[PDB]
């Protein structure tokens, strides 16, 4: 099963499955080498964006009751910008 390294600005590496990551076209392109650097995106935000990916892939096309995806006020604006850039 294929993984990729998403590296934050503060240099935290995050290993997510290729699929979960391709949830962003922005990232699809950055890859189209198994690693991606984000000058603008700090760990605390790129952690939540990887959580969002796992969440998206799980609860998409599931007959199950789907839960709210939570965002603390403190990180809403940055995650928002990050979302906009990644287009996901």
């Amino acid at each position: 099963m294929m993984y990729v390294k998403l590296i934050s600005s503060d240099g935290h590496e995050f290993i997510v499955k290729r699929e979960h990551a391709l949830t962003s076209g922005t990232i699809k392109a950055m890859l189209s080498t198994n690693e991606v650097n984000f000058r603008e995106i700090p760990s605390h935000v790129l952690s939540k964006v990887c959580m969002y990916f796992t969440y998206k892939v799980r609860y998409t096309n599931s007959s199950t009751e789907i839960p709210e995806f939570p965002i603390a006020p403190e990180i809403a604006l940055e995650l928002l910008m990050a979302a906009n850039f990644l287009d996901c």
Binding site: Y3, H12, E13, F14, P42, Y52, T54, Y55, P67, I75
Partner: protein, 103 residues
């Protein structure tokens, strides 16, 4: 059930999932895949409790109510090589700014 995990070590963090009904030996065969270091050489912890290779993930306190996709449970990772034992060290994530005055 299913469980959603962050397996962390220093400035590395692995996003992965498994069944509540999974042994912590199973979770190390996954890590062996990614980091190329076999399970004998791995020591997994829930906060600061070493996890026994035979126990189930649900055994250790990893429920589907605690380890969701949107908020996965953290799993400490330190390595070992013969008689030398790397200490568990998890680098904390960046901080946000102060909430702008408008919020």
């Amino acid at each position: 059930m299913d469980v959603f995990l962050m397996i962390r070590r220093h400035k590395t963090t692995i996003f992965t999932d498994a069944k509540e009904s999974s042994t912590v030996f199973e979770l190390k065969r996954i890590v062996e895949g990614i980091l190329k270091r076999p399970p004998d050489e791995q020591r997994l912890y829930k906060d600061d409790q070493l996890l026994d290779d035979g126990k189930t993930l649900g055994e250790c306190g990893f429920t589907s109510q605690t380890a969701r996709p949107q908020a996965p449970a953290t799993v400490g990772l330190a390595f070992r090589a013969d008689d030398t034992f790397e200490a568990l060290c998890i680098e904390p994530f960046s901080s946000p700014p102060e909430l702008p005055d408008v919020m």
